Amino acid sequence: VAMLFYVDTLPDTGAVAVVDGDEGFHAATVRRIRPGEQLVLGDGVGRLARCVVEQGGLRARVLRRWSVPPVRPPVTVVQALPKSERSELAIELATEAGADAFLAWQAARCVANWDGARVDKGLRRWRAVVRSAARQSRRARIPPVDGVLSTPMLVQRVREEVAAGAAVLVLHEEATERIVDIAAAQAGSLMLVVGPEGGIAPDELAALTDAGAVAVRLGPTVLRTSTAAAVALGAVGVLTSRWD
Amino acid sequence: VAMLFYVDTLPDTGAVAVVDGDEGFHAATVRRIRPGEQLVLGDGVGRLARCVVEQGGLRARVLRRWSVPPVRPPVTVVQALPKSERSELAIELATEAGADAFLAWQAARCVANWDGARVDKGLRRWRAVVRSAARQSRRARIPPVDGVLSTPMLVQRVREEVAAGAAVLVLHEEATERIVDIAAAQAGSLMLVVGPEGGIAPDELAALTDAGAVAVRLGPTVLRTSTAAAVALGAVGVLTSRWD
């Protein structure tokens, strides 16, 4: 199976392409791919190109180009992400599971205070992690990563999303409502809210539920920060036209 | 929220319990839990006990005991597991996702030859990994780990399972059948087959499909060895009475 490589701008059908020094070292020295073998190039924004290897630097000539339309209903994963290796994993698994975008949220039981620069460094790191998972998952569109939202910013976003016809689901353990019995197929968009390891506080939960979000449970399974979004995405895929 | 600790044998309602030296160091030195706080003890085989901390060693007196019946339809995760950190992760995420048992399989594109002792060491390691994930997932039943099956052993097991009314699903990328349109709710048992990183060979796939397994796809999402079972478990939870 052909390996995907992200490029800033996909070249035209006739044109050749050179893979960046670091990404091109992964193909010639790490993987060691012979010239004549055919790889796939992507702009990470919907466009894909089937390329044949001509020649440190990797030279591949486009055979054919095409674009992949965005998956509807798109799913946004809102996750309480601290500065940890566990956050990176959540972001990675959700990307493999097919998450369409990410919103980093600082919940009540998080509070790992960052400056303006640190939030920017932190988001750039997550973007690198998502780019890598997306590449290995042969994804045409790399899901965006944006943050870091406060609860009042998130609550305002839930109000805005619900009004625009989106289904906002808060993955909560002690929820009286099940994911199964939800108006999923009718919704034009979806937003999965995953709280921190310490869980969502009652004050935050009420604020989010009052905005239009619904607290939903994922069966008897205890919601784990690493698996919550990936398991919910598998449920959402079946409930919605996402896999149908 | 109370922490779960696995014990070989749960003591009676009146009786006190001492947590093992290594597991008891996790509560007094790692987590530092004050006496008077109440924890949960489990035998890892369906039985749970609510205990109050009396006193290196941790002394907890049972308040009340109870047993959790097995989840039906149970899901068995058959996974091509080599000796890697990626295998451990697959086993961990599936445990969080609610897998009921594991079968380690050596597929055509695996072949990391082990001796009788190594298979035994390897299975004991996976059991430790599953025990840890199960503990953090507050699981009453630790899913068993058994292997290492050959393709003819697996094919014979599929024939046996299908005959006993089980739905055997082979997670395959180029499958013409979708997980959505499957006789899931009627099945009394389920078996998810996850191949290696190199994928399932056509000869193995035919052997498994001829036995009674059905090649099923998980939407547009490229099946990744780490996420395949956890995403499928989320789909299976919705399709079956597992979450209903």
Q: What is the CATH number of the domain that holds B239?
A: 3.40.1280.10
Same domain, B56 and B173: no
How many C-beta atoms lie closer than 10 Å to residue B202's C-beta? 10
Question: Cα A30 to the chain's mean position, in Å?
Answer: 26
Domain boundary among A68, A92, A124: A68
Burial B46-84 (b: 16+ CB within 10 A, else e): ebbbebebeeeebebbbeebeeeeebebbbbbbbbbbee
Residues of chain B contacting A139 with CB distance shorter than 8 Å: 222
Method: X-ray
Nearest CA-CA partner of A93 in B96, B244, B130, B172: B96
Identify which of A1, A235, A244 has the shortest CB distance to residue B234: A235
Number of H helices, E strands in chain A: 6, 12
A238/B97 Cβ within 8 A: no
Q: What's the CATH code of the domain at A17?
A: 2.40.240.20
Domain boundary among A32, A50, A68: A68
Chain A contacts in chain B segment 30-89 (CB below 8 A)? 71
When scoring A88, A238, A240 by the number of chain B Cβ atoms within 10 A, the one with the most, hence best to mutate, is A238
Q: Please check whether residue B66 is in contact with residue B46, taking contact to mean a CB–CB distance below 8 angstroms.
A: no
Same domain, A87 and A104: yes
B138/A226 Cβ within 8 A: no
Same domain, B55 and B96: no
Q: Please check whether residue B102 is in contact with residue B77, taking contact to mean a CB–CB distance below 8 angstroms.
A: yes
Amino acid symbol at B117: A
Q: Please check whether residue A151 is in contact with residue A108, taking contact to mean a CB–CB distance below 8 angstroms.
A: yes
Residues of chain B contacting A234 with CB distance shorter than 8 Å: 218, 230-235, 237
Same domain, A22 and A112: no
Number of A:B CB contacts under 8 A? 114
Amino acid symbol at B49: A
Give the separation between CA A62 and CA B39, rounded to whole angstroms: 61
Give the separation between CA A44 and CA A141, rounded to whole angstroms: 5
Nearest CA-CA partner of B82 in B130, B129, B122, B124: B122
φ and ψ at A134, to 5 degrees? -60, -40
Same domain, B110 and B61: no
Q: Please check whether residue A196 is in contact with residue A60, taking contact to mean a CB–CB distance below 8 angstroms.
A: no
Chain B contacts in chain A segment 183-242 (CB below 8 A)? 199, 218-222, 224, 226-227, 230-235, 237-239, 242
User: What are residue B169's DSSP bridge partners?
Assistant: B192, B214
Give the separation between CA B123 and CA B115, rounded to whole angstroms: 12
Same domain, B192 and B202: yes
B238/A235 Cβ within 8 A: yes
How many C-beta atoms lie closer than 10 Å to residue B41's C-beta? 22
Same domain, A204 and A101: yes
Same domain, B42 and B125: no
When scoring A48, A227, A240, A242 by the number of chain B Cβ atoms within 10 A, the one with the most, hence best to mutate, is A227
Domain boundary among B68, B91, B115: B68
Same domain, A63 and A86: no
Residue B191 has which token pair? 């078996």
Give the separation between CA B14 and CA B64, rounded to whole angstroms: 9
Number of domains in chain B: 2
How many C-beta atoms lie closer than 10 Å to residue A207's C-beta? 17
Say if strands A75-79 and B38-42 run parallel, antiparallel, or are unpaired.
unpaired
Amino acid symbol at B134: A
Amino acid symbol at B22: D
Question: What Cα–Cα distance (Å) separates residue B16 from each residue in B40, B43, B65, B213?
Answer: 13, 15, 12, 49
Host domain of residue A108 = 69-244
Give the separation between CA B152 and CA B105, rounded to whole angstroms: 10
Stated resolution in angstroms: 2.9
Question: What Cα–Cα distance (Å) separates residue B161 from each residue in A18, A133, B168, B182, B187?
Answer: 51, 35, 8, 17, 11
Same domain, A176 and A102: yes
A199/B224 Cβ within 8 A: no
∠ CA B49-B54-B59 to the nearest 5 degrees?
A: 65
Residue A208 has which token pair? 């989010």
Residues of chain B contacting A226 with CB distance shorter than 8 Å: 93, 96
Same domain, A104 and A167: yes
Is A93 part of the contact surface with chain B (CB cutoff 8 Å)? yes
Same domain, B203 and B150: yes
Residue A95 has which token pair? 């990307």
φ and ψ at A147, to 5 degrees? 175, -165
Give the separation between CA A213 and CA A235, rounded to whole angstroms: 18
How many C-beta atoms lie closer than 10 Å to residue B208's C-beta? 24
When scoring B72, B96, B241 by the number of chain A Cβ atoms within 10 A, the one with the most, hence best to mutate, is B96
Calculate how close chain A gets to B178, using CA atoms only, in Å: 8
